[PDB]
Amino acid sequence: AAVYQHGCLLGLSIAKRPLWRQESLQSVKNTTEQEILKAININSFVECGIHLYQESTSKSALSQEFEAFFQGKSLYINSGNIPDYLFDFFEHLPNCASALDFIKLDFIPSRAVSLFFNWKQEFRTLEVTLRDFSKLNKQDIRYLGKIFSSATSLRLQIKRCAGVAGSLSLVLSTCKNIYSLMVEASPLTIEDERHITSVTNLKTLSIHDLQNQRLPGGLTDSLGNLKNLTK
């Protein structure tokens, strides 16, 4: 916990097989491999701390030692791979797992819903991303509802999703805590753009490769509604 300095930034690519997120977000623009590697190394550090916790046989005895360690840190979770120990970490060590500043959840299994939609706490800022979505099922939306809801504030990143066109408004309406929204080369309807321009709790907005070229009821006609927009 005393050590804060990173040190060497070479190698350490064993973790997170999707090192470049498997043809997803953090693409060619604004890569900065050096910062990506830091995030990976930090995540491994956090996991190591969790492993030490699991083997410390001190579930409640050493709550402070296992609080300071994680405070100010971030954790990455792949919805396609959720190790059993994650549940013990979050459920057996409350008021510590929540000390993390950020959780990064990519992609919907009910297991992801179970881990997040818990009683433990409403986690500060959740960063959630969607990749493999050619379709959005009602059950998927229902699950997202539960996942989005369990947070103080939300950051959402949607990339190359085909099932989202005409469904983005619906999904976004599930939770108004979203302040940061970006869409990567994913088609949207005017109704989706209207929803976005109509929500004034946004601070960050990023529009990539939207070629409707006709958005009267939308951002190209106004976008003066988002008074809280800063980015």
Other residues' Cβ atoms within 10 Å of the Cβ of residue 198:
13
CB nearer other proteins, residue 165 or residue 175: 175
Give SS3 for 125: strand
| Residue span binding other proteins (CB under 8 A) among the ranges 86-94, 109-117, 124-132, 186-194 | 109-117
Shortest distance (Å) from residue 176 CB to other proteins: 10
CB nearer other proteins, residue 114 or residue 198: 114
Among 47, 65, 91, 122, binds other proteins (CB under 8 A): 122
Closest CA to 70 of 92, 53, 104, 46: 46
What CA–CA distance (Å, rounded) separates 98 from 120?
A: 9
Shortest distance (Å) from residue 113 CB to other proteins: 7
Among 74, 118, 220, 225, binds other proteins (CB under 8 A): 118
Among 22, 56, 114, 212, binds other proteins (CB under 8 A): 114
Q: Are 16 and 40 in contact (CB under 8 A)?
A: yes
User: With contacts defined by CB under 8 A, how many residues of the chain interact with other proteins?
Assistant: 11
Among 75, 113, 168, 178, binds other proteins (CB under 8 A): 113
CB nearer other proteins, residue 51 or residue 111: 111
What CA–CA distance (Å, rounded) separates 75 from 47?
A: 8
Shortest distance (Å) from residue 177 CB to other proteins: 9
Q: Tokens at residue 42, please? A: 């930090």
- Within 39-78, which residues bind other proteins (CB under 8 A)? none
CB nearer other proteins, residue 102 or residue 117: 117
Tokens 């106004």 locate to 222
- Within 136-175, which residues bind other proteins (CB under 8 A)? 145-146, 149-150
Give SS3 for 9: coil
What DSSP line would sit under 16-83, residue for residue? -S-TTTTTSSS-STT--HHHHHHHHHHHHHHHHHHHHHHTTT-TTTTTTHHHHTTTT-EEEEETTB--
Interacting residue ranges for other proteins, rule: CB under 8 A: 110, 113-114, 117-119, 122, 145-146, 149-150
